[PDB]
Short mmCIF file of C-alpha atoms and ligand atoms in Angstrom, two decimals:
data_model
loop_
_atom_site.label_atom_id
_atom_site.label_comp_id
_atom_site.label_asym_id
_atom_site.label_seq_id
_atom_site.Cartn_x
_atom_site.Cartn_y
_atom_site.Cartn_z
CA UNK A 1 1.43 6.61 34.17
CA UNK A 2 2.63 4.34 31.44
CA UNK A 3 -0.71 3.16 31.20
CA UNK A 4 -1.79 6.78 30.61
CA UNK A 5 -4.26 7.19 27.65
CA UNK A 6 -1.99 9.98 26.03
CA UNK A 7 1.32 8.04 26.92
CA UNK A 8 -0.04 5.21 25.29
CA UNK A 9 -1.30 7.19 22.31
CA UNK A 10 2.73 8.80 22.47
CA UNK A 11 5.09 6.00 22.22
CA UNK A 12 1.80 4.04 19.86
CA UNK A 13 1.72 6.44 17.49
CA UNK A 14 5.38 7.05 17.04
CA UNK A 15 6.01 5.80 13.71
CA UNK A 16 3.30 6.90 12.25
CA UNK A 17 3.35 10.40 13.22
CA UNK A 18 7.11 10.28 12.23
CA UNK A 19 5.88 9.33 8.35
CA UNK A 20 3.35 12.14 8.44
CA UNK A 21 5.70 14.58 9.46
CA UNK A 22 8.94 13.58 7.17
CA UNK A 23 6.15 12.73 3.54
CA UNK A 24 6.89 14.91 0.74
CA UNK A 25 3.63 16.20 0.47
CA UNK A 26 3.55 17.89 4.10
CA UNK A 27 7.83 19.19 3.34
CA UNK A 28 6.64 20.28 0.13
CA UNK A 29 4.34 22.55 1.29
CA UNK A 30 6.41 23.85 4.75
CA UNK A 31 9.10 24.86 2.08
CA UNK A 32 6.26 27.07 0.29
CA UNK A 33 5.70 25.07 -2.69
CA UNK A 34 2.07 24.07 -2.68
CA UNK A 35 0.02 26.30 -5.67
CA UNK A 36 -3.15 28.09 -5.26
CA UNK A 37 -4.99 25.30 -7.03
CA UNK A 38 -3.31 22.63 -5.05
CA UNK A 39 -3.71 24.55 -1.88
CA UNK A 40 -7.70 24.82 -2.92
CA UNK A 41 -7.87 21.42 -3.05
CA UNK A 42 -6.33 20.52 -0.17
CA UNK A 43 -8.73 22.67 1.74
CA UNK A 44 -11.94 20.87 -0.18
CA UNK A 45 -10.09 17.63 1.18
CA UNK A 46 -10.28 19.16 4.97
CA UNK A 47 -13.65 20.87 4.78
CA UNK A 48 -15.37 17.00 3.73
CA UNK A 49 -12.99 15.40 6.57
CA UNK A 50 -14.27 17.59 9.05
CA UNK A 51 -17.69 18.02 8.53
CA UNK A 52 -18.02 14.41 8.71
CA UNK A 53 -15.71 14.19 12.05
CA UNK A 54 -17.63 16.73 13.46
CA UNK A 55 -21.04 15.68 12.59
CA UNK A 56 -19.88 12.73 14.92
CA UNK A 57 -18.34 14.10 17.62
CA UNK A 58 -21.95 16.00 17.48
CA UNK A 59 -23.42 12.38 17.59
CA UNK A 60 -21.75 11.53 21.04
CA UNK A 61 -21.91 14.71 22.88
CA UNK A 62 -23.57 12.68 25.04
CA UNK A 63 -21.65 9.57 24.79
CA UNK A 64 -19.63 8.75 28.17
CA UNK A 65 -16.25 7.50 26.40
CA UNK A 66 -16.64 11.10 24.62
CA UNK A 67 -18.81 13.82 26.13
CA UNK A 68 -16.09 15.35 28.33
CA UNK A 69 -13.98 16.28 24.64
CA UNK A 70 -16.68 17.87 22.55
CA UNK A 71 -15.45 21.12 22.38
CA UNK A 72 -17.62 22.45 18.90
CA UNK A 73 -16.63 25.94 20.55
CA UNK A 74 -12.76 25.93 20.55
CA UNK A 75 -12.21 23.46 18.33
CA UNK A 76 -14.35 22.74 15.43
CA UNK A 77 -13.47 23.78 11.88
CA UNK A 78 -16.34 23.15 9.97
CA UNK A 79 -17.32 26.99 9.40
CA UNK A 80 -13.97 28.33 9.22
CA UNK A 81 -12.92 25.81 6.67
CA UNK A 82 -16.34 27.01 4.98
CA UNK A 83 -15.65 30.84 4.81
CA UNK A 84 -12.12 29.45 3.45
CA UNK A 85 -13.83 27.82 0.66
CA UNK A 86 -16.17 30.84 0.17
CA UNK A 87 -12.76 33.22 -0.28
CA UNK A 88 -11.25 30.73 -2.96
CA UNK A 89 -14.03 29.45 -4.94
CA UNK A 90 -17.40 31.98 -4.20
CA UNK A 91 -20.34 31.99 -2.77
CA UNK A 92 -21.61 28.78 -4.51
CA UNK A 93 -18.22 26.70 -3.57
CA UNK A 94 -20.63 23.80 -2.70
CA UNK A 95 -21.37 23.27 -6.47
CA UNK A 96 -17.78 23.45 -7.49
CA UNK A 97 -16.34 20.86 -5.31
CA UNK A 98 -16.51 17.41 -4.51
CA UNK A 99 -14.56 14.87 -1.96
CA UNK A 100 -11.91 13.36 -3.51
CA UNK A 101 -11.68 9.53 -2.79
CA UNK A 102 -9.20 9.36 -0.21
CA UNK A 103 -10.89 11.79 1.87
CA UNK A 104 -14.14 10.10 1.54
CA UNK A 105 -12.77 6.80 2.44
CA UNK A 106 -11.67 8.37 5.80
CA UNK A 107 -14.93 10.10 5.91
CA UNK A 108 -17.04 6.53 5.71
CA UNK A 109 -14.40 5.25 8.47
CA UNK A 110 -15.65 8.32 10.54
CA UNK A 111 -19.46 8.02 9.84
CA UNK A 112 -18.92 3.91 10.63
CA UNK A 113 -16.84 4.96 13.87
CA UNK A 114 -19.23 7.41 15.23
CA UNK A 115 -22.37 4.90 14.70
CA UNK A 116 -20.65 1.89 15.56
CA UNK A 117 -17.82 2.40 18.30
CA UNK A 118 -18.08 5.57 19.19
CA UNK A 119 -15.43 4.77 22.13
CA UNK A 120 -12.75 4.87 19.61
CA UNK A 121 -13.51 8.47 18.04
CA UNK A 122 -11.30 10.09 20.78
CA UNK A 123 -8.61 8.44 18.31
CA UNK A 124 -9.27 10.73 15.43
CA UNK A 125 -10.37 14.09 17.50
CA UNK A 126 -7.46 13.51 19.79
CA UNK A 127 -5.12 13.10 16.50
CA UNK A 128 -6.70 15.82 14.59
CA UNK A 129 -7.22 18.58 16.81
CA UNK A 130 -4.11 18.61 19.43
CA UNK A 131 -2.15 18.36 15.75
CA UNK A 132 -4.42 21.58 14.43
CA UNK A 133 -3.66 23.16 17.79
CA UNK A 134 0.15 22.59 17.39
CA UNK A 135 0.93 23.69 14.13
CA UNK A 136 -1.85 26.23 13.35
CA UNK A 137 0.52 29.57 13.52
CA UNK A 138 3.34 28.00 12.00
CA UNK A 139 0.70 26.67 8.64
CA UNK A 140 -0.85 29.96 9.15
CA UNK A 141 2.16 31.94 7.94
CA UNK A 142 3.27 29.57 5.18
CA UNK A 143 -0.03 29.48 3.03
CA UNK A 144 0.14 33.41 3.77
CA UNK A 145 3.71 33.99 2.41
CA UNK A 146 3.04 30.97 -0.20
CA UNK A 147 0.10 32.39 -1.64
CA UNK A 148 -0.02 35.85 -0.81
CA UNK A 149 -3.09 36.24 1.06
CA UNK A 150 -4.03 38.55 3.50
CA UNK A 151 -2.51 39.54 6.52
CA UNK A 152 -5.90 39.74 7.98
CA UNK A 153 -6.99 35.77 7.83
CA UNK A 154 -9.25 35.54 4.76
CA UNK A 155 -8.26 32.35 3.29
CA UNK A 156 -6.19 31.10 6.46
CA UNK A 157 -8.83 30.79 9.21
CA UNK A 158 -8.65 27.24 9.63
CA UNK A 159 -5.29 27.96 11.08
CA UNK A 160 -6.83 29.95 13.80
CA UNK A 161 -8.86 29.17 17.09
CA UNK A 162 -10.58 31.74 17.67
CA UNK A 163 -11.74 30.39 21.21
CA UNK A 164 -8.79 29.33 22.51
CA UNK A 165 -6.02 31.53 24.31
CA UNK A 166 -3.34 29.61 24.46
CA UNK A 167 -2.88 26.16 22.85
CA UNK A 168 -0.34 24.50 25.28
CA UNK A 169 -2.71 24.77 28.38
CA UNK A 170 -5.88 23.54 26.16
CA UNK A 171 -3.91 20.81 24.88
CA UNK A 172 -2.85 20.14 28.52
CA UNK A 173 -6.82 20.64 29.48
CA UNK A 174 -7.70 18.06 26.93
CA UNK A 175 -5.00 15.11 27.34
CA UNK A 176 -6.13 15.53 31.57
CA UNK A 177 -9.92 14.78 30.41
CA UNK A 178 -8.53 12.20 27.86
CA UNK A 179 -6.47 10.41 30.73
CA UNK A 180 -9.53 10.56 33.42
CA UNK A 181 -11.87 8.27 31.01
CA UNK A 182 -12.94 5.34 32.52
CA UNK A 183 -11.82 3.12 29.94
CA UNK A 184 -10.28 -0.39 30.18
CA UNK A 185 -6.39 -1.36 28.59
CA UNK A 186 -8.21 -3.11 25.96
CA UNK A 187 -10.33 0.13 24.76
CA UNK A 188 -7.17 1.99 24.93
CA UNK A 189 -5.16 -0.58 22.70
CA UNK A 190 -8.29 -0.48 20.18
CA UNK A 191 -7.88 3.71 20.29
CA UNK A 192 -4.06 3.42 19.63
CA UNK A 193 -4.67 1.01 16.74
CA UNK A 194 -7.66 3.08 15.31
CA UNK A 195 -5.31 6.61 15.66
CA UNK A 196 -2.79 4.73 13.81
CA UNK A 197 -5.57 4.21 11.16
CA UNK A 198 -6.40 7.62 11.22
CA UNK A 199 -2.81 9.25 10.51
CA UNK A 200 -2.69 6.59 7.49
CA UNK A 201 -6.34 8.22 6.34
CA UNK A 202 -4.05 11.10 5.88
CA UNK A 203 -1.21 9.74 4.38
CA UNK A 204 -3.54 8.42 1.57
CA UNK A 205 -4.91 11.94 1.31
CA UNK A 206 -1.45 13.65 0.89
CA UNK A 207 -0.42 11.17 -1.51
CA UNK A 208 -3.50 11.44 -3.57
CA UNK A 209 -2.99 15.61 -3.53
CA UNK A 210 0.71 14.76 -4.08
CA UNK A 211 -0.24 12.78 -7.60
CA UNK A 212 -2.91 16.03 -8.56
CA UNK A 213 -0.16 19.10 -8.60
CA UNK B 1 -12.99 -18.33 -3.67
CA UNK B 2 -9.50 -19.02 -2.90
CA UNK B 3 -7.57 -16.05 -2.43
CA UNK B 4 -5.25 -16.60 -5.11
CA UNK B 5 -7.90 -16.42 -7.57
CA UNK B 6 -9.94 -13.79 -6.03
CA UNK B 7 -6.65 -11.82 -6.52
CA UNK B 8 -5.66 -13.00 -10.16
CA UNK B 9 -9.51 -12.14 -11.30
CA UNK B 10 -9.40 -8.89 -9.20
CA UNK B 11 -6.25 -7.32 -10.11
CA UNK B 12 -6.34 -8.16 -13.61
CA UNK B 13 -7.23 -4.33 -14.94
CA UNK B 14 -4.42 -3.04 -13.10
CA UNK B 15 -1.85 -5.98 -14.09
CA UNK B 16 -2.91 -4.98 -18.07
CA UNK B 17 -2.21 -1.43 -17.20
CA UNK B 18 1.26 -2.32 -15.87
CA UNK B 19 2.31 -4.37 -19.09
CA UNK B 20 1.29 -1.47 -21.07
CA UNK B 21 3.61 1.53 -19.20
CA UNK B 22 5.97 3.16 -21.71
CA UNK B 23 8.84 1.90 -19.52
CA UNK B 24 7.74 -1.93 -19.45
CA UNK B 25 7.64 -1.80 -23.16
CA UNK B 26 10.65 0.05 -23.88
CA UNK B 27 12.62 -2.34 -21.51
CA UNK B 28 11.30 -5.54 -22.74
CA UNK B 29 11.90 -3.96 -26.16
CA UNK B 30 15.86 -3.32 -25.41
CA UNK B 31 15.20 0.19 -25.37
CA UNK B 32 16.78 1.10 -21.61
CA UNK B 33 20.24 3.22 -20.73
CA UNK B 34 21.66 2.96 -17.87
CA UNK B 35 21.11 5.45 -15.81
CA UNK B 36 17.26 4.71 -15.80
CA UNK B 37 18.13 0.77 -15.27
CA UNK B 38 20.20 2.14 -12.24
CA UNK B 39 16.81 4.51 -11.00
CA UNK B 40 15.10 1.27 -11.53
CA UNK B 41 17.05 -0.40 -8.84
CA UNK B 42 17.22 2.09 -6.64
CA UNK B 43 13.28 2.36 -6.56
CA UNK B 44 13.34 -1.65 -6.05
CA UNK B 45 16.09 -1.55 -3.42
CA UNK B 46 14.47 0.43 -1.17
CA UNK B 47 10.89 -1.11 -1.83
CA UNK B 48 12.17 -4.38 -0.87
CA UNK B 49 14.05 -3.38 2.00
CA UNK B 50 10.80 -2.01 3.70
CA UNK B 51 9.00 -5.10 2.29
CA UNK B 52 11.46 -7.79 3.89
CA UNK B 53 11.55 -5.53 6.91
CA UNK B 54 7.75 -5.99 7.78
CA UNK B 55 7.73 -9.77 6.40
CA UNK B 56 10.52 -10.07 9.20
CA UNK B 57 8.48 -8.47 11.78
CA UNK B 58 5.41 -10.73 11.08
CA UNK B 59 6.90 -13.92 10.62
CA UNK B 60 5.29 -15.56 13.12
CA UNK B 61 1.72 -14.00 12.80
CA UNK B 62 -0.86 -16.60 11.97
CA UNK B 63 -2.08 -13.91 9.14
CA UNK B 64 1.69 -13.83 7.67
CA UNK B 65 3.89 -16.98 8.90
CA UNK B 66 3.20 -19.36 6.30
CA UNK B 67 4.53 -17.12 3.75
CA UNK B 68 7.84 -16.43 5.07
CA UNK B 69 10.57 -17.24 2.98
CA UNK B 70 13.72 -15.49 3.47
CA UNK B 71 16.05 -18.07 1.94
CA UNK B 72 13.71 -18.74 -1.25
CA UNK B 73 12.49 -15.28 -2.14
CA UNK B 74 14.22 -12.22 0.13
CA UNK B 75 15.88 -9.97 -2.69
CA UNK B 76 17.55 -7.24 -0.43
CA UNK B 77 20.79 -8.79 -0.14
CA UNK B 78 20.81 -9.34 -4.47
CA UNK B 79 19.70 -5.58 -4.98
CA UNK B 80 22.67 -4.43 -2.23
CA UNK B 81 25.19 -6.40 -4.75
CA UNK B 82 23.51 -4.67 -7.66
CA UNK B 83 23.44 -1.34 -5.93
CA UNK B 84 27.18 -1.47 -4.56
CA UNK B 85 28.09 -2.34 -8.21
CA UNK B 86 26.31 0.56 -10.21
CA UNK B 87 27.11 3.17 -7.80
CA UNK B 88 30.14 2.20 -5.65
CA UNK B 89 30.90 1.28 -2.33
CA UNK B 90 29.83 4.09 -0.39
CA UNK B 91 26.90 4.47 -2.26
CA UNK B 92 23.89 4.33 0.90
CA UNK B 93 25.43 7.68 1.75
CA UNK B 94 24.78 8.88 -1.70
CA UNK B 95 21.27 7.58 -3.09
CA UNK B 96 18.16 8.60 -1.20
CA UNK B 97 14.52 6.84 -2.37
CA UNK B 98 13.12 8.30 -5.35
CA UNK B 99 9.66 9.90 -4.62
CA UNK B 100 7.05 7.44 -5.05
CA UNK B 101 9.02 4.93 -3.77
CA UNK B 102 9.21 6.33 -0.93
CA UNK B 103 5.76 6.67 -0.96
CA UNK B 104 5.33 3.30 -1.01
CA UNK B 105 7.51 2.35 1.69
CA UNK B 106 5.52 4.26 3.65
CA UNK B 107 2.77 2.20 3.00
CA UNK B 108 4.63 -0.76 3.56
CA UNK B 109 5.46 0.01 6.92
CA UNK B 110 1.85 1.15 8.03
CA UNK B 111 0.69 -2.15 6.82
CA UNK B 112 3.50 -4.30 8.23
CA UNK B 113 3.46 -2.45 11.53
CA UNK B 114 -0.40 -2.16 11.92
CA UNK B 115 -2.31 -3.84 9.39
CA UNK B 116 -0.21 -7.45 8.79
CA UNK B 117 -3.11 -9.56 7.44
CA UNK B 118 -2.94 -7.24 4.45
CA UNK B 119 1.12 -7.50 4.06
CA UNK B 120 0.05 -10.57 1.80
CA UNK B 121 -1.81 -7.82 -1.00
CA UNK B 122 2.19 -6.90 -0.99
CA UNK B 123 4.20 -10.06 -0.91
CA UNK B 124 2.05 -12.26 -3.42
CA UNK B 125 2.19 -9.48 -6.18
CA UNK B 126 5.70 -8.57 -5.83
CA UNK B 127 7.24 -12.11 -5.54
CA UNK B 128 4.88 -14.05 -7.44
CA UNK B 129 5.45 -11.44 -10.77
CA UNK B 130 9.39 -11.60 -9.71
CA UNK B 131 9.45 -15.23 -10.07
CA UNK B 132 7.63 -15.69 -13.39
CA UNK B 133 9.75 -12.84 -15.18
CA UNK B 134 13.50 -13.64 -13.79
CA UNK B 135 14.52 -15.70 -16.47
CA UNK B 136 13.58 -13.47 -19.33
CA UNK B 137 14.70 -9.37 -17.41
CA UNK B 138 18.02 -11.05 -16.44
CA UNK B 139 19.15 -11.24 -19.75
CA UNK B 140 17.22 -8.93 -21.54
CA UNK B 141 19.06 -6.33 -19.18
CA UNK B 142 22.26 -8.08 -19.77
CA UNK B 143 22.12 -7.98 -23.23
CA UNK B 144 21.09 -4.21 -23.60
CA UNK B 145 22.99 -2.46 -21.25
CA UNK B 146 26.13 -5.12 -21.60
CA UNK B 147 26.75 -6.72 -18.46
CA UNK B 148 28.70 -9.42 -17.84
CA UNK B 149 27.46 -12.78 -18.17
CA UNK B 150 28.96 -13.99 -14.63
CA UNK B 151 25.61 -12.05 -13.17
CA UNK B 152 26.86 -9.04 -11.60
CA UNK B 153 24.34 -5.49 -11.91
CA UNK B 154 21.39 -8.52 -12.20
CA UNK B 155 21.17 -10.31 -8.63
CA UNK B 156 17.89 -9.13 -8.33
CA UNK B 157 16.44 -11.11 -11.37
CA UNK B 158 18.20 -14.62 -10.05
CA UNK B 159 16.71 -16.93 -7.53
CA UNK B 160 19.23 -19.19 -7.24
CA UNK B 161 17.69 -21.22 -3.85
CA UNK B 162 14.40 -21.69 -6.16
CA UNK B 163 15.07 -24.93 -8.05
CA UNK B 164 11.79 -24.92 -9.50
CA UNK B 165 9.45 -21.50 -10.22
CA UNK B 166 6.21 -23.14 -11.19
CA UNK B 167 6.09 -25.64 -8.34
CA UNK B 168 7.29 -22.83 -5.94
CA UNK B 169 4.23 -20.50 -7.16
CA UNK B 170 2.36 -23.83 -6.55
CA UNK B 171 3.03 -24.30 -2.87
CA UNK B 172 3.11 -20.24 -2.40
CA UNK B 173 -0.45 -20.51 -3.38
CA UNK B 174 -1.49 -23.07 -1.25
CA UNK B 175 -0.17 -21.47 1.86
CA UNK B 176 -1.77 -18.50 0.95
CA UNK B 177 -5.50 -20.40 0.35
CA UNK B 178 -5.05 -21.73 3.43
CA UNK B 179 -4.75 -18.52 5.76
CA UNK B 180 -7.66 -18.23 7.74
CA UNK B 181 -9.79 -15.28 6.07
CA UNK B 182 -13.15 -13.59 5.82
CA UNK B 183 -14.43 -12.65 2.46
CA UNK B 184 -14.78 -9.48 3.92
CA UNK B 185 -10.70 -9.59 4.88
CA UNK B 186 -10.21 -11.12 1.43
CA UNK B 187 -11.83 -8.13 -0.47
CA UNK B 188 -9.47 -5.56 1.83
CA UNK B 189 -6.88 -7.75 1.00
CA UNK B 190 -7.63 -7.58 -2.86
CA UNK B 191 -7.97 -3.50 -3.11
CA UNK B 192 -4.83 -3.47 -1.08
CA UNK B 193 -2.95 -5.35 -3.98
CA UNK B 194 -4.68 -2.85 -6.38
CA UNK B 195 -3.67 -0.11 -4.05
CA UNK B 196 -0.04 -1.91 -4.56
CA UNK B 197 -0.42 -1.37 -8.19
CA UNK B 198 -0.84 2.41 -8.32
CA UNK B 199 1.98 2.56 -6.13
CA UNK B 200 3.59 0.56 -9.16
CA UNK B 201 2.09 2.88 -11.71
CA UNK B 202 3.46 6.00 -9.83
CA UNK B 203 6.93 4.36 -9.81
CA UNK B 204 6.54 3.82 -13.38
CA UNK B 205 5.04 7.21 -14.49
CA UNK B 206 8.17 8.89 -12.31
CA UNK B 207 10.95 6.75 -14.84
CA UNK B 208 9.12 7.51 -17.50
CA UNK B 209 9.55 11.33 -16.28
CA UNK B 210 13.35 10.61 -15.32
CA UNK B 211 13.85 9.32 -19.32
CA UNK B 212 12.18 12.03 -20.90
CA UNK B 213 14.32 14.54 -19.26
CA UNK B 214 17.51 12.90 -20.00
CA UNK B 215 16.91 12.10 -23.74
CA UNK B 216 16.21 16.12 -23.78
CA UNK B 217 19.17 16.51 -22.18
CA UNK B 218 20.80 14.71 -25.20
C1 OXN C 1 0.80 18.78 6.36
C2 OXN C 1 -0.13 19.93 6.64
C3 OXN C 1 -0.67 19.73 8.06
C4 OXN C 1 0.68 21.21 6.52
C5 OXN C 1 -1.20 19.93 5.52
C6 OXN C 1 -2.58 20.55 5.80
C7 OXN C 1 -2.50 21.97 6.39
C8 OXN C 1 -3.27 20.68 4.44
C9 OXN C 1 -3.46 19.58 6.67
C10 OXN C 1 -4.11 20.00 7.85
C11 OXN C 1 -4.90 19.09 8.58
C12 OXN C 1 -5.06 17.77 8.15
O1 OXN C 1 -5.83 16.88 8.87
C13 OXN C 1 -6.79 16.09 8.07
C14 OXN C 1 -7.94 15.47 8.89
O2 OXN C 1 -7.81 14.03 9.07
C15 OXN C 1 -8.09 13.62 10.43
C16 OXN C 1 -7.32 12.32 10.70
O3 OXN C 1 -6.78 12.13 12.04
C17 OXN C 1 -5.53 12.82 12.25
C18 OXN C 1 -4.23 12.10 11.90
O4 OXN C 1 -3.14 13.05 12.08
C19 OXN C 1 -2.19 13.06 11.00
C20 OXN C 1 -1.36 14.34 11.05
O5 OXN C 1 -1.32 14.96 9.74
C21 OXN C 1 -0.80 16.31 9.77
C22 OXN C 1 0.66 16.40 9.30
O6 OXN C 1 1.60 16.02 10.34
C23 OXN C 1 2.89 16.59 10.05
C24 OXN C 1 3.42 17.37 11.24
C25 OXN C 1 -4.40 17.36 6.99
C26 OXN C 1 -3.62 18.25 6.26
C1 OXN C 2 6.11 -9.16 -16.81
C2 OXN C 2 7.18 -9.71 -15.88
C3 OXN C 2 6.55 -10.82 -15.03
C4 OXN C 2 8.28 -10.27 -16.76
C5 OXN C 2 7.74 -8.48 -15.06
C6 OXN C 2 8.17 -8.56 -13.55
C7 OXN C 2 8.88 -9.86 -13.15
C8 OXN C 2 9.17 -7.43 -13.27
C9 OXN C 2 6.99 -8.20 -12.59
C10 OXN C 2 5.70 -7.99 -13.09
C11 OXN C 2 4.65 -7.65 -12.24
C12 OXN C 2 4.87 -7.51 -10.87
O1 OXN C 2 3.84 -7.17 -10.04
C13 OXN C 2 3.61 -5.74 -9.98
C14 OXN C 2 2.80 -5.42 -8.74
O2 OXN C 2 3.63 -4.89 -7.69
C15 OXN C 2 3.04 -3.68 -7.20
C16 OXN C 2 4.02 -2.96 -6.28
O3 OXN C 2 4.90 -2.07 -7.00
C17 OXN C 2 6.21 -2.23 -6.43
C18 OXN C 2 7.25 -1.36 -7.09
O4 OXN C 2 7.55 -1.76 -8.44
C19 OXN C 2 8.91 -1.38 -8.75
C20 OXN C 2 8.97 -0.58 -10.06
O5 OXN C 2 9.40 -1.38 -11.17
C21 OXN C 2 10.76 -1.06 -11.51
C22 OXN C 2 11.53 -2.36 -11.69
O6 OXN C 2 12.11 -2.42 -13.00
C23 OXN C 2 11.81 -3.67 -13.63
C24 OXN C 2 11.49 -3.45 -15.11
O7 OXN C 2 10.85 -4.63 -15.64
C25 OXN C 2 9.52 -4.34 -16.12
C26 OXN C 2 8.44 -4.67 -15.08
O8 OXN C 2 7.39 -5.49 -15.65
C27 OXN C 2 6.10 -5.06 -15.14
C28 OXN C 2 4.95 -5.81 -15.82
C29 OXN C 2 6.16 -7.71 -10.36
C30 OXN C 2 7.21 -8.05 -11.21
#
């Protein structure tokens, strides 16, 4: 069980999910520093990411290394990240906005992923989501306080699945489907390495929104 | 191209920009007080700890190994010297990395740790630019901030196991040309050293910050 997807994914990742958690950027805004402007473009950053991720993952529905984790129900964040942006910026939020570089280098990695090896995708859903899953409540509650928004969820409902009950036992749902692929130690090494790419996507996004505010 | 000179051509923007910072000037000038000399090598120490760290690691990867020189060009040991003499013995306990250095240890370590054929974007601007511009920091710092002339506070600056600097950069170079490389590697590996620079330029903008506040302060 060593040679478990998600164990592999565990002790691989383990550095770099240690970097993401303890970089300024990510402390700065648990503590409730992060501005409304800052916070706005942090959420522009996540609406281009996931689109594109998404758009992907829509791609290989189909795909057997993938089909048995598209979950566009429970999971995807595309139109709650877009009634987000609608709150802050207006109806026409699409004109105001654009991807800032970092994000649209991980969003070319995605695009080139999902066309190219689509085996390897379950690297950045995997990565993304069970994260999203995790800390939703917690994230939820800060940007609330932080920025005084509503009690209700306007503003904050990329924070919350909608479609899912209770994170622990879809996480635990997800990891079982992740660990039955019939995929070979050599596709599971290339998914470690390429998840490891993916948290340092991120890293280069906080550090770009770390240099803006 | 050889890499060295798809690197000298393809950095050259940012290497201008670096001259140019309001901290290289003032430095080279005479212009710096201590306490920013001592942020300065605090922001080095712990850059070239994570830098030797990863160098270590890859030392026998065939996209690293021929640049591996701990005895010629490892600085960690100098900056510890320089660090225990500005702040003290216990001083680790004390000093934490300053912001965007710490930044850009991260970066260090995801590249060391995942990415290695890149680690040379890091090494060849760091230790190439070191080498050329000993001589001249040592004693410009020495001479402005009046340290002794024994070497202590300055470690960093001295390579005293490099007998020669040009022919050093010579066969550095020729390692380096010989890696075995794509263009397509060598181009990530040139963005990577401009991606190094910003790093730099973030370092540099946060001193600049740090001296501002401290001649309003007096
Ligand atoms: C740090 C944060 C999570 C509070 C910032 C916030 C809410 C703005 C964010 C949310 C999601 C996010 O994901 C971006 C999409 O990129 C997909 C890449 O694959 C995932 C790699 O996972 C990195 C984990 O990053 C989250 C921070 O971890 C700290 C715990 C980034 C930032
Ligand atoms: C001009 C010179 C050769 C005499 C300068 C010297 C030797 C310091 C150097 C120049 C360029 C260089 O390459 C820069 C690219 O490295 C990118 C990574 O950034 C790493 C972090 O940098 C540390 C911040 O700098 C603080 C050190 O304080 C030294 C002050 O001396 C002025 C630096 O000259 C820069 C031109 C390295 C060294």
């Amino acid at each position: 069980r060593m040679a478990d997807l998600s164990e592999l994914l565990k002790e691989g990742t383990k550095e770099a999910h240690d970097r993401a958690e303890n970089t300024q950027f990510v402390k700065d805004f648990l503590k409730g520093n992060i501005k409304k402007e800052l916070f706005k473009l942090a959420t522009t950053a996540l609406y281009f990411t996931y689109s594109a991720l998404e758009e992907e993952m829509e791609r290989n529905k189909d795909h057997p290394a993938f089909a048995p984790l598209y979950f566009p129900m429970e999971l995807h964040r595309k139109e709650a990240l877009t009634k987000d942006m609608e709150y802050f910026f207006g109806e026409n939020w699409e004109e105001q906005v654009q991807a800032p570089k970092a994000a649209q280098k991980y969003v070319e990695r995605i695009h080139y992923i999902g066309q190219n090896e689509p085996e390897l995708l379950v690297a950045h859903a995997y990565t993304r989501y069970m994260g999203d899953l995790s800390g939703g409540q917690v994230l939820k509650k800060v940007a609330q306080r932080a920025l005084k928004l509503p009690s209700t969820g306007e503003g904050t409902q990329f924070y919350l699945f909608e479609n899912v009950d209770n994170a622990q036992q879809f996480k635990q749902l997800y990891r079982a489907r992740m660990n039955a692929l019939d995929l070979n130690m050599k596709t599971k090494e290339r998914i470690v390495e390429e998840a490891n790419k993916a948290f340092e996507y991120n890293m280069q996004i906080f550090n770009e929104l770390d240099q803006a505010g």
